[PDB]
Design a protein around this ligand. Structure first.
Ligand SMILES: Nc1ncnc2c1ncn2[C@@H]1O[C@H](COP(=O)(O)OP(=O)(O)OP(=O)(O)O)[C@@H](O)[C@H]1O
Ligand SMILES: Nc1ncnc2c1ncn2[C@@H]1O[C@H](COP(=O)(O)OP(=O)(O)OP(=O)(O)O)[C@@H](O)[C@H]1O
Ligand SMILES: [Mg+2]
Ligand SMILES: [Mg+2]
Ligand SMILES: [Mg+2]
Ligand SMILES: [Mg+2]
Ligand SMILES: [Mg+2]
Ligand SMILES: [Mg+2]
Ligand SMILES: [Mg+2]
Ligand SMILES: [Mg+2]
Lengths: 336, 336
């Protein structure tokens, strides 16, 4: 039995590896709060009357620089976003870099500059790190860990029947932009990745409706919106009913995804949050998102239902319904 | 200008890159305590009346399994040790793995088992992680971040004139064991790496003499004892006078290092701490170390002096003195 690319593709195949190998082999998995067995965006640790939130992501995107971003902006954004979707204000990042021998120094400088500019947007400091250089022909991997503070951690398992389901903006941008760049597809300008830190979007909603009314969040990275919704449904043991027409998709992303034969629901996003909120606070949450720049295209896309537990339904036409199937993996290689 | 293997070798060449490129490019570098500009084993953040300590290390050792350890034991030990030498009790680890397509699943299982066994020694939980798979022929990289709590952070810059300098055990074991394994050198058994978590050793000293009397620590990883001592001397702006005969070296390590033509002072250790303590507490500190299993071979090896600031002197014979020169880099490739 060998490790396959699919094991790193973030959908059902990776999930099987996490449950059957990682969780079964490691025994000390919690520091007192949300731990490894939860398989959430991060872990939580009680500290005083608040919670430390801890997360880590490796980044292996190709190419290192792409329209709308780069591995540096991705490394800061992805880790800030994992903290944000746990309800945590980012307070520190750690930066591990593994660099291929022969990489031009200017590339390292460019990546670091992008990391700093992105971190300044949050704002969050990069307070510690590590540098390794290998003879392997890898260009560069960047691995960022993050610490945040949450007064009220938000899980991916807390969705309740009746809740509204929101997305903070258009879906499919990162994965489709990346594939379009590789394939020479472009319109008046190249499609841009959405990679960006979105703590400001989450914070805006919390300040408006209160943490208690944010019932679940995930950032729809590898394997996309579909994976994120299926995970929330499964872990919350509820059904999710989505109106397909209400999912925001950039016209250029729709067109390119058609040319590529790739579903925009199944590819990583890098500047988005999926949020599940108390029914009576849905419109307030939506308005709070839309008042921000990064949440300007936010939409309510569905609702949590009591039947079809652990499933996601897509509503089309005048009422017709089918399943939004959880991908086996993100179809875009080296997407993150 | 290109990135060279030396930039990942942990001595003067890497230090130049950190100062001239990393520190000059990143602008947000501190979360309120020891930050990136200190270039210490980790960073610190005020929280209540204590401090959160944060660290990260990538691990790229070859081979993945070696006498005395493996990349999994190394990943847990190295990050626990970086927390320990900041004065921090480990409370959580994060585990990023980047795996080469085609690696046998049993290798991943073995690495995870070793991580768990090592973590259980501390004890510390692995609470969050990430898995990426790349087509590159790398086998596996493991990147661990750690969070600890320190009541009283210990820097690498706090050495005071008159202080005693201790090491917790024999020097050179990891690097020399690794090179000996690669080269087919062995005695009755193969030389073993010392890779192990040593929070218990540091804690033992603190419980005996108090944190205030531990003035500086570093773990002598890449570029060895020499690098660690030179760093403490430079950052504390003091001289360090070492009695060469008092530095514990395993007889087999001495012999092998002679055959290899490599200095045991210049290669990474993975189960050791260099500690600088108040003069009047030196013997108590030494006794506390020696009562532990992992510190059983601890020795007082020198003292901090007012002249030769930023330098390390080696005393031999009946009083003769030369410089212990800071290495340009660890001479052992892929040592960590
Ligand atoms: N090698 C590993 N060791 C320990 N835990 C892991 C490992 N890989 C993944 N995990 C855990 O599995 C769960 C799912 O991880 P995943 O990386 O999909 O989360 P994510 O970062 O939110 O998504 P993405 O990596 O696509 O951004 C998380 O709780 C994570 O902590
Ligand atoms: N790519 C990077 N980005 C930010 N900070 C870095 C980076 N590489 C190293 N650092 C910082 O440089 C200092 C020296 O790092 P180094 O990795 O030598 O520490 P160490 O982990 O104690 O040693 P070793 O890696 O050999 O175990 C540390 O303070 C670390 O936080
Ligand atoms: Mg995921
Ligand atoms: Mg996530
Ligand atoms: Mg992530
Ligand atoms: Mg390091
Ligand atoms: Mg070092
Ligand atoms: Mg260190
Ligand atoms: Mg280290
Ligand atoms: Mg991840």
């Amino acid at each position: 039995e060998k490790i396959k690319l699919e094991h790193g593709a973030g959908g059902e195949i990776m999930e099987e590896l996490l449950r059957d190998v990682i969780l079964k082999t490691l025994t000390l998995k919690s520091a007192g709060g949300i731990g490894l067995d939860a398989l959430d965006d991060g872990a939580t640790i009680p500290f005083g009357d608040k919670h430390i939130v801890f997360t880590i992501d490796g980044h292996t995107v190709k190419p290192l620089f792409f329209p709308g971003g780069d591995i540096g902006r991705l490394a800061v954004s992805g880790t800030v976003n994992d903290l944000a979707v746990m309800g945590a204000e980012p307070i520190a990042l750690a930066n591990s870099m593994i660099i291929g021998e022969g990489l031009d120094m200017e590339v390292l400088k460019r990546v670091l500059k992008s990391m700093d500019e992105t971190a300044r947007e949050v704002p969050v400091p990069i307070v510690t790190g590590d540098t390794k250089v290998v003879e392997d022909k890898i260009e560069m991997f960047v691995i960022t860990a993050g610490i945040g503070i949450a007064e009220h951690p938000v899980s991916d398992a807390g969705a309740k029947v009746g809740d509204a389901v929101l997305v903070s903006g258009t879906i499919g941008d990162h994965g489709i932009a990346l594939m379009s760049h590789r394939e020479g597809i472009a319109f008046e300008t190249e499609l841009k990745s959405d990679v960006a830190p979105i703590w400001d979007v989450v914070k805006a909603v919390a300040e408006t409706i209160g943490w208690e009314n944010i019932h679940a969040m995930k950032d729809p990275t590898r394997a996309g919106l579909s994976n994120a919704l299926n995970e929330i449904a499964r872990k919350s043991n509820v059904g999710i009913l989505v109106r397909e027409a209400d999912i925001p998709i950039r016209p250029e992303v729709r067109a390119a995804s058609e040319m590529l034969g790739i579903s925009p629901y199944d590819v990583a996003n890098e500047g988005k949050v999926v949020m599940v909120v108390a029914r009576e606070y849905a419109e307030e949450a939506l308005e709070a998102m839309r008042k921000t720049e990064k949440g300007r295209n936010a939409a309510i896309i569905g609702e949590v239902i009591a039947d079809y537990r652990g499933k996601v339904l897509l509503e089309t036409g005048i009422g017709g319904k089918r399943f939004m199937e959880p991908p086996e993996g993100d179809p875009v290689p080296r997407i993150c």
